[PDB]
Design an enzyme around this catalytic site. Structure first.
Site, PDB file in Angstrom:
ATOM      1  N   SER A  53       1.490  19.095   1.291  1.00 15.12           N
ATOM      2  CA  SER A  53       0.578  18.223   2.065  1.00 15.12           C
ATOM      3  C   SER A  53       1.258  17.863   3.395  1.00 15.12           C
ATOM      4  O   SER A  53       0.572  17.830   4.415  1.00 15.12           O
ATOM      5  CB  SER A  53       0.220  17.015   1.264  1.00 15.12           C
ATOM      6  OG  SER A  53       1.371  16.226   1.013  1.00 15.12           O
ATOM      7  N   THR A 107       3.682  16.103  -1.128  1.00 11.23           N
ATOM      8  CA  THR A 107       5.012  16.762  -1.065  1.00 11.23           C
ATOM      9  C   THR A 107       5.250  17.313   0.344  1.00 11.23           C
ATOM     10  O   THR A 107       4.289  17.827   0.951  1.00 11.23           O
ATOM     11  CB  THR A 107       5.116  17.890  -2.097  1.00 11.23           C
ATOM     12  OG1 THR A 107       4.990  17.355  -3.412  1.00 11.23           O
ATOM     13  CG2 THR A 107       6.426  18.634  -2.015  1.00 11.23           C
ATOM     14  N   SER A 121       3.334  12.242   0.631  1.00  9.75           N
ATOM     15  CA  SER A 121       4.802  12.340   0.812  1.00  9.75           C
ATOM     16  C   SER A 121       5.381  10.962   1.107  1.00  9.75           C
ATOM     17  O   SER A 121       4.739  10.217   1.864  1.00  9.75           O
ATOM     18  CB  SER A 121       5.119  13.288   1.933  1.00  9.75           C
ATOM     19  OG  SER A 121       4.247  14.414   1.917  1.00  9.75           O
ATOM     20  N   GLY A 169       2.535  21.853  -5.245  1.00  3.28           N
ATOM     21  CA  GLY A 169       1.459  22.342  -6.124  1.00  3.28           C
ATOM     22  C   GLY A 169       1.598  21.717  -7.495  1.00  3.28           C
ATOM     23  O   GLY A 169       2.216  20.635  -7.570  1.00  3.28           O
ATOM     24  N   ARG A 182       8.762  11.719  -3.432  1.00  5.46           N
ATOM     25  CA  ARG A 182       7.567  11.048  -4.015  1.00  5.46           C
ATOM     26  C   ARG A 182       6.831  12.002  -4.963  1.00  5.46           C
ATOM     27  O   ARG A 182       6.422  13.078  -4.520  1.00  5.46           O
ATOM     28  CB  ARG A 182       6.603  10.564  -2.926  1.00  5.46           C
ATOM     29  CG  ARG A 182       5.254  10.098  -3.467  1.00  5.46           C
ATOM     30  CD  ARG A 182       4.300   9.532  -2.426  1.00  5.46           C
ATOM     31  NE  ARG A 182       4.838   8.361  -1.748  1.00  5.46           N
ATOM     32  CZ  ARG A 182       4.179   7.635  -0.855  1.00  5.46           C
ATOM     33  NH1 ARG A 182       2.932   7.935  -0.535  1.00  5.46           N
ATOM     34  NH2 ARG A 182       4.770   6.603  -0.279  1.00  5.46           N
ATOM     35  N   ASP A 216      11.040  15.503   0.411  1.00  3.94           N
ATOM     36  CA  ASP A 216      10.766  14.067   0.140  1.00  3.94           C
ATOM     37  C   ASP A 216      10.947  13.862  -1.364  1.00  3.94           C
ATOM     38  O   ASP A 216      11.138  14.868  -2.071  1.00  3.94           O
ATOM     39  CB  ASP A 216       9.381  13.651   0.632  1.00  3.94           C
ATOM     40  CG  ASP A 216       8.275  14.055  -0.326  1.00  3.94           C
ATOM     41  OD1 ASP A 216       8.006  15.264  -0.433  1.00  3.94           O
ATOM     42  OD2 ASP A 216       7.708  13.158  -0.979  1.00  3.94           O
ATOM     43  N   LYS A 238      13.012  17.079  -5.906  1.00  2.00           N
ATOM     44  CA  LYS A 238      12.160  18.286  -5.803  1.00  2.00           C
ATOM     45  C   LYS A 238      13.072  19.497  -5.599  1.00  2.00           C
ATOM     46  O   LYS A 238      12.561  20.626  -5.648  1.00  2.00           O
ATOM     47  CB  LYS A 238      11.125  18.045  -4.703  1.00  2.00           C
ATOM     48  CG  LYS A 238      10.374  16.734  -4.873  1.00  2.00           C
ATOM     49  CD  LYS A 238       9.054  16.692  -4.163  1.00  2.00           C
ATOM     50  CE  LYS A 238       8.444  15.309  -4.136  1.00  2.00           C
ATOM     51  NZ  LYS A 238       7.283  15.278  -3.218  1.00  2.00           N
ATOM     52  N   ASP A 273       2.112  11.461   6.300  1.00  2.00           N
ATOM     53  CA  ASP A 273       1.402  12.117   5.166  1.00  2.00           C
ATOM     54  C   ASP A 273       1.463  11.233   3.919  1.00  2.00           C
ATOM     55  O   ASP A 273       2.581  10.976   3.437  1.00  2.00           O
ATOM     56  CB  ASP A 273       1.988  13.485   4.821  1.00  2.00           C
ATOM     57  CG  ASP A 273       1.251  14.176   3.689  1.00  2.00           C
ATOM     58  OD1 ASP A 273      -0.001  14.055   3.641  1.00  2.00           O
ATOM     59  OD2 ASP A 273       1.929  14.828   2.867  1.00  2.00           O
TER      60      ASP A 273
HETATM   61 MG   LIG Z   1       3.428   9.013   3.659  1.00  2.00          MG
END
Ligand SMILES: [Mg+2]
Ligand SMILES: *C(=O)[C@H]1NC[C@@](C)(O)[C@](O)([C@H](CC2CCCCC2)NC(=O)[C@H](Cc2ccc(OC)cc2)NC(=O)[C@H](CCO)NC(=O)CN2CCOCC2)O[C@@H]1C
Ligand SMILES: [Cl-]
Ligand SMILES: [Mg+2]
Ligand SMILES: [Mg+2]
EC number: 3.4.25.1
Lengths: 125, 244, 195, 204, 244, 250, 222, 243, 198
Positions: free
Chosen positions: G129, G1, G169, G47, G19, G17, G33, G166
């Protein structure tokens, strides 16, 4: 919460709520029991003020407590259901812990002990 | 109809609470007790009626201390007074434990007020059968308080309750006028002794025993203490002289 | 790194501005000086959760105190912190300095380390960065300094604690508590690093 | 140990042109030992279908629980609970045991009776909703099902085509998992009628 | 204290009757009439809406006929609000029995539990009884079609045909007259309406003042159906039986 | 201390009346007139803002209240009883519905929940019944527009149109004449303003009349944009200004 | 995230994001989100997903009730205090980390909350993250007196830094813009720079390819 | 039958006698209070009566500082008044802790109103024999007056008055607002709003005041303070030099 | 673990249950009946933790016997199994769970069909043609997978057990001291007293 003393002594040493409970029993449809040499018989009258009933499903007056003990009654029908259920549970409880069905005296002594408690407990008639 | 005086939390049609007013009678029926605010402290005094020669003298003490700096004296039902002080002590312990400073007298007075008042909210309790005079010395000066069975309380220059309240309230009114600059603690003790001897005349049949206490920044270091020995005899005499 | 110092005109409170989660800086410009009343401040060191929960409860306790009994003493503010930290010592990781100014006792500084004990002191240092400045602070603190000397003493002291402690950094915030009221001072790296 | 891997089992659901499908295996095991080849994981309350993978006792208990709740729902509301609403009930019901959760991976599937819109959703064991348009997967061979579904699936499939695609996804995923298979069932669901089919699959 | 204001709702008369029960029965005698009739091939529930207006929405309206299960219904006579409290705990007992045993609750079992709840308000707690009488029409696979009745006293009995609420004496005489054991559901519906038609305290019996329910076992299925008749369907069945 | 009032203060009398529930209806009869009308495409609830003093700001007293974005309530009887009932009603719409099914309860059920609280005050130890009658107007996807009446007993009934309070007997008679099943919302705001003119003694304008509608969704009253499914609340209180425009065509 | 909030001159913007992941597996390629606590107070979580969804709705409900009781718009400082006292009570066992942003009577606010019930304020924040990739871009490009358009760009770029670098994400960029004057504008999938390429084949099966044993119609109807 | 007058249950006319008698109690202190809004302030005047010469005048007050921003004046017996004061002080502190902004005037009024409503419905609690006038300069609403009574009633006022001669002060204030055609005192300084309050209190009661017969509280943007005897004597000298 | 076998044939359910009770290094008893009669046509066999095993059995028994008198009627095998499953599923999330596995064999006099339920200590219930608990299942399921037929007589059923018990006497490490065998059919419950060499 509600613990008002409903069964109390009056000046002449009488518990009127216990007295008036007996009057509700007088009003109850008659019941009789005669024990023979080798048997006992329970006989109970049925009212005739209202007749168009279902006799298959209407709760009959003699109740089985265990397979060897029965209980007929006179008085308030709804009150009798609460005594029967309590007696039926003590029957199973006794088998579970003593590994033996109740005596008739024991089952009686229990039902008598419950009736007594509801004469000196707050909040109950 | 009627019946508005049989239950404690009930308002009569004239907006009163008759059970509170009946408690006052219990108070008015009791022994006389006073307070005198001096220029850096407070003085408490009470009439102790001698029922017989069998009462051990000096030994049935009626003035109670709260924490180390607060005095309380009451008139009416003595046990109800004691119950109230037992609560005052719990209340002063609680406040000190949290805030570290000993309880300021105003803060203490409202802690008694709210409790006494709580005993007029419910028919399951009886109002307090006492009027209480209490006070002492805090961070900013001396305070004298009086507290009614209703939980009504105010600050006083001087206070009095019980049998001989009019006599005391009259004597107290004279001192307020005849000392605008403020009475001293030494002086207030003598004056308090006089006002108990004078107010005793509305009870003159039974012999009595004088009891004084004081809380003065200069004379006791702002701690509550009883008046004993020479200073007690010097006060009884100042009263014994001016009763004649 | 947090400290309070008792001087002539009152008391002074300073702190770094770093909030870290391991070796990651989460915020480099936080304010760790929190007001409890008009002239009573706390400096927070330890768990961000534990310190922030405590500061909010003490604030409430003093707002309620004020409503009933008027202005609380600095000693009182410290006693509320002590009580919370002592009674919850099994679940708390907070180190708190309490600094107050009234007109009676002027500037006072109280410190409440991990156990929940209270220590009144002329000056208190605390937090990870403090270990590095015991020697400096002890050789340089005097009683009855001026506002300008005390800001200098605290600016220099925290400067060294930021240099040496990787758990401290950012700006140095200060709060000056005197008769005149509350003064907020900030010092940026470009000023304090070259001392 | 891991309550999610004692009994084994899978569920998948897919959306198509004015239809949804939900399929499951029939295995109930105790570790290596297969015990029952009849244990169905797909229940229905009105026109809303729920699949439940995981610890089998919890699968049984949740089905009993959502039957109880949807029944009282119908008595009070005087209508059948819709998919969107049932999803939230499952979510709030799971979150309510946040610190002692049911070890399950539930999957809702059905058509909205008012909007005609095909709907699917899945949930973690504490009721985090996953509401993808395309497909939802759950159980011991989830990884496998993810790779079958992602590769096989296209949008707007007719019911008869969808049936092939969900069947081939489930079958080919279960034959790569030791704790899934022993038979399977597929529900094809349309606005009006619903067809249930038992599949022929490897019995190892 | 509080003792002064306690009615004492759970006491015996000198005669051995329960005041509050008796008076609650009095309450129920003024409520709209409800009729249960059991046939060979189903059960009829009919009830009369006490008070109506031109403006009372009859479509979104249910005051007398409630579904407890999919196999059990009740007709109410008494306080609507008191009934909804009991109906709601009855619906829960039925689901707790289904969750526990994976079988639908036998009718007598549900009826006993509801009667047991009322019985409680009659012997302990100090609260008023529920001013409510129920007709329970249900089917199970042990006793088939069953018609029960319960009242504030906590007492229950089974019936071939029964009435509760207003004019029960008059209604019971007219049913006892024209009931026969070999009766059919369509015969029962007709009997149910005739009875209401002659015990009504109103001019005519129109569709807008009626609720109607039948529990039949549709011969083209082999399972039990509950029909709570819609306004237009009461209006139909009213013209067929020749009441127009 | 301690509530030692664990027994009912509402008991059956030998005549079978519940004393306190009848006395509550008497208190509701002294109350100011309030009414409700159900149109084909909306519902209107209305009442008089009987200002206690002219120094009092009548605006600061909502006799009409939003319960959920598609439900509204109004009352006759004791305003304090209403105020705590609205408070409990808004919070039970959340705990017993929205926190479980993630949507707002339908009108009949929220009404059911209000009714239940009022019944408990008829039977619970140590309380009196609430001295109000409520008129609750709402919409939900599956039942369309509705209008319910709730009484001190806990009983509730659905109405096409009705009134409660002082001039209810006459207000009801006037609504019977003017009501049909083809009314548009505007037509019903007009009939509500007519019916309420018979009840009001002194001034009759936008500042003495409180009137709200359940109708079309109001996207401009939502607070945010970008979610198409969310079209905003159906409940809208009319402004002082909006009432006066419709009074000049009376 | 990856989530970020960026204060601008006349309000606050947050972005995230799209995902969702069960361990290393992408469960939802495009989930939102961005949740609302009230119309003009938006929220973004990382989390334990179920913990952020649950705590966001509980405080959203308690804030709606509070708004009706007080007859006032909800305040961000209110949402913050409510969230912090609940998270703190649960000692970190409720794995909720939120960036909360909104406008109210008192102006524009931007806070973060962590699981233990710690709070943070600033002109720019990031969480997840993706935290460190985002914060690199913000620390590099942020300035005082941003325009609405410059705050959306900077927020978007910060989410991108997370999407690309990341693994936790990816997919799209959701943005919510809260301006002191006007309504909040939620921009679902503001960027879609990760569309799948047309697959090489159709894997549509010839009908009857799957072997069936038993077929039956089910009774939905009652 | 004759016990529907002792506890808070309906009489056959649908009335709570205990609430009506509790209202009666509110006049027991025989004190008149009034409040008026200025442009950016809110002033409450209350008569101060000290019968006893033994009393400490400084401690006799019916005006309370509930929070930094909110002031309360009580018409009724002081034990109840103080009960209501401590509860409002407690609630205003709990509000701030839980929601992170200062409790607004009208919300505290509503909350104290709902507390009184309960004594109206539960039998073991008696109503408080008090009327509570809450004043502030609220940060959304501006100058604010909200007042609660033993019924559980509360409402916002342009101005208000309470006590035995309430009806005479009210009609006096109404008459001034009919003329001025505005709902506040058009005055920049609070000193002149206090002068107006006292002036109109004199006209209505037909009585002159010394510094020790009055009690004044003022709510400004982020403070509510009460005046000293000397702040009042300043104000009394001002009205004097105009007559 | 102990041996708990069940097998449903045409017109009966047969439960077979090991007679050994073993604490540590000593076989204490060699004649243990690991079964309670719940109702005249429903029987429950059990194995698990020392104490919990009988305590759970006797508790269920008492509850079913209570229900029987109150309603003057015998619960279906399906109803008894569902009651028992739910009791265990509560126990599993309680302070100290009952560690007891059960088979319930009953004859449904309404359906005129025998029924065998296997339920583990978690509340995992399933209907089976044949069932087992503990290590026993590792041998018997594949055996019965081969030799079982649904149309078998009670007599065939008993030969199918004699085949299961021999296989277990051959390959299992424990001496379980043979089995006690009970038949549940239309006529109630009777104990096959000659299984020692049948
Ligand atoms: Mg990525
Ligand atoms: C001078 O000595 C400074 N030392 C630096 C520093 C950062 O450690 C700290 O103590 C600072 C104190 C202020 C207090 C006011 C709030 C802001 C921070 N501490 C932290 O920033 C703190 C570090 C820390 C965490 C945990 C514990 O014990 C459990 C002690 C210290 N940071 C945090 O708590 C972050 C906050 C994120 O918003 N959170 C975490 O580290 C998460 N952990 C929670 C505990 O469990 C492990 C995960 O400043 C002094 C003055
Ligand atoms: Cl409230
Ligand atoms: Mg496999
Ligand atoms: Mg295999």
């Amino acid at each position: 919460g509600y613990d008002r003393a409903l069964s109390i002594f009056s000046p002449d040493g009488h518990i009127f709520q216990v007295e008036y409970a007996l009057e509700a029993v007088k009003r109850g449809t008659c019941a009789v029991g005669v024990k023979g040499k080798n048997c006992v018989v329970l006989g109970c009258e049925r009212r005739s003020t209202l007749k168009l009933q279902d006799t298959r499903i209407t709760p009959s007056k003699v109740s089985k407590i265990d397979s060897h003990v029965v209980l007929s009654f006179s008085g308030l029908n709804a009150d009798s259901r609460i005594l029967i259920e309590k007696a039926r549970v003590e029957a199973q409880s006794h088998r579970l812990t003593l590994e033996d069905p109740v005596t008739v005296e024991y089952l009686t002594r229990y039902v008598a002990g419950v009736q007594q408690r509801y004469t000196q407990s707050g909040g109950v008639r | 109809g009627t019946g508005y005086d049989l239950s404690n939390s009930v308002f009569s049609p004239d907006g009163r609470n008759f059970q509170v007013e009946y408690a006052v009678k219990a108070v008015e029926n009791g022994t006389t007790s006073i307070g005198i605010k001096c220029n850096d402290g407070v003085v408490f005094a009470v009439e102790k009626l001698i029922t017989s020669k069998l009462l051990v003298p000096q030994k049935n003490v009626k003035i109670q201390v709260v924490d180390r700096h607060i005095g309380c004296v009451y008139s009416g039902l003595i046990p109800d007074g004691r119950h109230l002080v037992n609560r005052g002590r719990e209340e002063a312990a609680s406040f000190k434990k949290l805030y570290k400073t000993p309880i300021p007298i105003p803060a203490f007075a409202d802690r008694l007020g709210q409790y006494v008042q709580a005993h007029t909210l419910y028919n399951s309790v009886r109002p307090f059968g006492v009027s209480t005079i209490f006070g002492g010395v805090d961070k900013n000066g001396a305070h004298l308080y009086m507290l009614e069975p209703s939980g009504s309380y105010w600050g006083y220059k001087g206070a009095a309750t019980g049998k001989g309240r009019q006599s005391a309230k009259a004597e107290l009114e004279k001192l307020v006028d005849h000392h605008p600059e403020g009475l001293s603690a030494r002086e207030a003790v003598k004056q308090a002794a006089k006002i108990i001897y004078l107010a005793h005349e509305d009870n003159k049949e039974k012999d009595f025993e004088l009891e004084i206490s004081w809380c003065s920044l200069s004379e006791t270091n702002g701690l509550h203490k009883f008046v004993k020995g020479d200073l007690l005899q010097e006060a009884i005499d100042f009263a014994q002289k001016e009763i004649n | 790194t947090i400290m309070a110092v008792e001087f002539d005109g009152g008391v002074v409170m300073g702190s770094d501005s770093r909030v870290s989660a391991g070796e990651a800086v989460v915020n480099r410009v936080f304010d760790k000086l929190s007001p409890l009343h008009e002239r009573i401040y706390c400096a927070l060191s330890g768990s961000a959760a534990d310190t922030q929960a405590i500061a909010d409860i003490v604030q409430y306790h003093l707002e309620l105190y004020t409503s009933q009994y008027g202005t609380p003493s600095t000693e009182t503010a410290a006693s509320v912190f002590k009580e919370l930290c002592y009674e919850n010592k099994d679940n708390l990781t907070a180190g708190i300095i309490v600094a107050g100014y009234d007109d009676k006792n002027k500037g006072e500084v109280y410190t409440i380390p991990l156990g929940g004990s209270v220590h009144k002191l002329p000056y208190a240092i605390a937090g990870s960065g403090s270990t590095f400045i015991y020697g400096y602070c002890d050789k340089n603190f005097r009683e009855n300094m001026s506002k300008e000397e005390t800001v200098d003493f605290i600016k220099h002291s925290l400067s060294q604690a930021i240099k040496w402690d990787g758990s401290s950094g950012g700006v140095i915030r200060m709060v000056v508590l005197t008769a005149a009221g509350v003064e907020r001072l900030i010092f940026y790296p470009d000023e304090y690093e070259q001392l | 140990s891991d309550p999610s891997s004692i009994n084994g089992g899978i569920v998948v659901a897919m959306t198509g042109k004015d239809c949804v499908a939900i399929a499951c295996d029939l295995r109930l095991g105790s570790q290596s030992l297969g015990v029952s080849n009849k244990f169905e994981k797909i229940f229905h309350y009105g026109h809303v279908f729920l699949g439940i993978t995981g610890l089998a006792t919890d699968v049984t208990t949740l089905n009993e629980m959502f039957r109880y709740k949807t029944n009282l729902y119908k008595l009070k509301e005087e209508r059948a609970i819709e998919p969107e609403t049932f999803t939230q009930l499952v979510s709030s019901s799971l979150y309510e045991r946040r610190f002692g959760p049911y070890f399950v991976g539930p999957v809702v599937a059905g058509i909205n009776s008012k909007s005609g819109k095909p709907f699917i959703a899945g949930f973690d064991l504490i009721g985090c909703i996953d509401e993808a348009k395309d497909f939802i997967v759950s159980g011991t061979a989830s990884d496998q099902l993810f790779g079958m579904c992602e590769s096989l699936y296209e949008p707007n499939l007719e019911p008869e085509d969808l049936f092939e695609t969900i069947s081939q996804a489930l079958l080919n995923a279960a034959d790569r998992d030791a704790l899934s298979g022993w038979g399977a069932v597929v529900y094809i669901i349309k606005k009006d009628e619903v067809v249930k089919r038992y599949l022929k699959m490897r019995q190892d | 204290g509080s003792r002064r204001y306690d009615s004492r709702t759970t006491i015996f008369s000198p005669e051995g009757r329960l005041y509050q029960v008796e008076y609650a029965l009095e309450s129920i005698s003024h409520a709209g009439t409800a009729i249960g009739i059991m046939a060979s091939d189903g059960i009829v529930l009919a009830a009369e809406r006490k008070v109506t207006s031109t403006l009372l929405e009859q479509d979104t309206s249910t005051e007398k006929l409630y579904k407890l299960n999919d196999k059990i219904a009740v007709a109410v006579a008494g306080l609507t609000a008191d009934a909804e409290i009991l109906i709601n705990t009855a619906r829960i007992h039925a689901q707790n029995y289904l969750k526990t045993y994976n079988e639908d609750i036998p009718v007598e079992i549900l009826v006993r539990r509801l009667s047991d709840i009322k019985q409680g308000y009659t012997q302990h707690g100090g609260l008023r009884p529920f001013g409510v009488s129920f007709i329970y029409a249900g089917y199970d696979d042990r006793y088939g079609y069953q018609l029960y009745t319960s009242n504030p006293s906590g007492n229950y009995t089974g019936w071939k045909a029964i009435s509760v609420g207003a004019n029960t004496s008059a209604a019971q005489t007219l049913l006892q007259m024209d009931y026969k054991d070999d009766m059919k559901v369509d015969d029962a519906i007709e009997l149910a309406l005739k009875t209401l038609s002659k015990t009504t305290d109103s001019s005519a019996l129109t569709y807008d003042r009626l609720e109607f329910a039948t529990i039949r076992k549709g011969a083209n299925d082999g399972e039990v159906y509950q029909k709570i008749f819609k306004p237009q369907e009461i209006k139909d069945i009213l013209v067929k039986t020749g009441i127009t | 201390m301690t509530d030692r009032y664990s027994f009912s203060l509402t008991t059956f009398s030998p005549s079978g009346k519940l004393g306190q529930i009848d006395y509550a209806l008497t208190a509701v009869k002294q109350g100011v007139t309030s009414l409700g009308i159900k149109a084909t495409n909306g519902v209107v609830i209305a009442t008089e803002k009987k200002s206690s003093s002219p120094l009092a700001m009548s605006e600061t007293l909502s006799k009409v209240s939003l319960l959920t974005p598609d439900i509204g309530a109004v009352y006759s009887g004791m305003g304090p009883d209403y105020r705590v009932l609205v408070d409990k009603s808004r919070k039970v719409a959340h705990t017993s519905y929205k926190r479980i099914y993630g949507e707002y309860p339908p009108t009949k059920l929220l009404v059911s929940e209000v009714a239940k609280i009022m019944q408990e005050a008829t039977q619970s130890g140590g309380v009196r019944p609430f001295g109000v009658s409520l008129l609750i107007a709402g919409h939900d996807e599956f039942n369309g527009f509705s209008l319910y009446q709730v009484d001190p007993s806990g009983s509730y009934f659905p109405w096409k149109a009705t009134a409660i309070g002082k001039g209810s007997v006459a207000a009801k008679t006037f609504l019977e004449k003017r009501w049909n099943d083809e009314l548009e919302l505007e037509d019903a705001i007009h009939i509500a303003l007519l019916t309420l003119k018979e009840s009001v003694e002194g001034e009759f304008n936008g500042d003495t009349i409180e009137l709200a509608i359940i109708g079309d969704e109001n996207p401009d009253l939502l607070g945010y944009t970008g979610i198409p499914t969310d079209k905003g609340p159906r409940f809208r209180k009319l402004t002082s200004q909006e009432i006066n425009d419709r009074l000049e065509a009376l | 995230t990856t989530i970020v909030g960026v204060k601008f001159n006349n309000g606050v913007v947050i972005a995230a994001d799209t995902r969702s992941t069960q361990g290393p597996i992408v469960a939802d390629k495009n989930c939102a989100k961005l949740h609302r606590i009230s119309p003009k107070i938006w929220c973004a979580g990382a989390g334990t997903a179920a913990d952020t969804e649950a705590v966001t709705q509980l405080i959203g409900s308690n804030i709606e009730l509070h708004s009706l009781y007080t007859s006032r718009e909800p305040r961000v400082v209110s949402a913050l205090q409510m969230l912090k006292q609940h998270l703190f009570k649960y000692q970190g066992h409720i794995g909720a980390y939120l960036i909360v942003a909104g406008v109210d009577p008192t102006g524009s606010h931007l806070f973060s909350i962590h699981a233990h019930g710690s709070t943070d304020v600033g002109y720019y924040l990031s969480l997840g993250s993706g935290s460190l990739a985002a914060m690199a871009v913000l620390e590099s490009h942020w300035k005082q007196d941003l325009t609405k358009e410059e705050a959306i760009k900077l927020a978007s770029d910060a989410i991108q830094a997370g999407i690309w670098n990341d693994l936790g994400s990816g997919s799209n960029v959701d943005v919510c813009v809260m301006e002191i004057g006007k309504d909040a504008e939620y921009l679902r999938n503001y960027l879609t720079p990760n569309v799948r390429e047309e697959k090489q084949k159709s894997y549509k099966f010839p009908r009857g390819t799957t072997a069936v044993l038993k077929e039956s119609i089910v009774n939905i109807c009652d | 039958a004759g016990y529907d007058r002792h506890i808070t249950i309906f009489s056959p006319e649908g009335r709570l006698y205990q609430v009506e008698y509790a209202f009666k109690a509110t006049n027991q202190t025989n004190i008149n209070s009034l409040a008026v809004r200025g442009k950016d302030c809110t002033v409450v005047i209350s008569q101060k009566k000290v019968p006893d010469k033994l009393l400490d005048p400084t401690t006799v007050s019916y005006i309370f500082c509930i929070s930094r921003t909110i002031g309360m004046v009580v018409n009724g017996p002081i034990p109840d008044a103080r009960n209501a004061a401590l509860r409002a002080k407690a609630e205003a502190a709990e509000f701030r802790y839980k929601y992170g902004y200062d409790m607004p005037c009208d919300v505290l009024a509503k909350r104290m109103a709902n507390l009184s409503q309960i004594y109206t419905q539960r039998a073991y609690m008696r109503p408080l024999g008090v009327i509570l006038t809450f004043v502030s300069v609220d940060e959304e609403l501006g100058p604010s007056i909200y007042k609660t009574d033993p019924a559980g009633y509360y409402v916002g006022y342009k101005a208000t008055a309470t006590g035995p001669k309430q009806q005479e002060i009210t009609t006096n204030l109404e008459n001034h607002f009919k003329k001025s055609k505005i709902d506040h005192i058009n005055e920049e300084s609070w000193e002149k709003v206090v002068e107006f309050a006292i002036t109109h209190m004199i006209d209505a009661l037909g009585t002159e005041f010394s510094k020790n017969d009055l009690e004044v509280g003022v709510a400004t943007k982020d403070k509510f303070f009460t005046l000293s005897a000397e702040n009042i004597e300043e104000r009394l000298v001002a009205i004097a030099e105009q007559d | 673990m102990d041996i708990i076998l069940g097998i449903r044939v045409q017109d009966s359910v047969i439960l077979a249950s090991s007679k050994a009770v073993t604490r540590g290094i000593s076989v204490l008893k060699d004649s243990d009946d690991k079964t309670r009669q719940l109702s005249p046509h429903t029987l429950m066999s059990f194995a698990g933790e020392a104490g919990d095993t009988v305590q759970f059995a006797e508790y269920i028994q008492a509850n079913i016997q209570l229900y029987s008198i109150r309603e003057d009627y015998e619960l279906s095998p399906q109803a008894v199994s569902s009651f028992v499953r739910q009791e265990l599923a509560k126990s599993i999330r309680s302070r100290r769970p009952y560690q007891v596995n059960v088979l319930i064999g009953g004859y449904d006099k309404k359906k005129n069909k025998p029924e065998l339920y296997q339920i583990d200590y978690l509340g995992t219930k399933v209907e089976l043609p044949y069932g087992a608990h503990g290590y026993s299942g590792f041998y018997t399921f594949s055996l019965l997978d081969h030799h079982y037929r649904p149309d078998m007589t009670t007599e065939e059923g008993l030969d199918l057990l004699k085949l299961c018990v021999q296989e277990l006497e051959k390959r299992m490490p424990m001496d379980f001291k043979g089995v006690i065998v009970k038949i549940v059919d239309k006529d109630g419950i009777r104990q096959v007293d000659d299984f020692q060499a049948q």
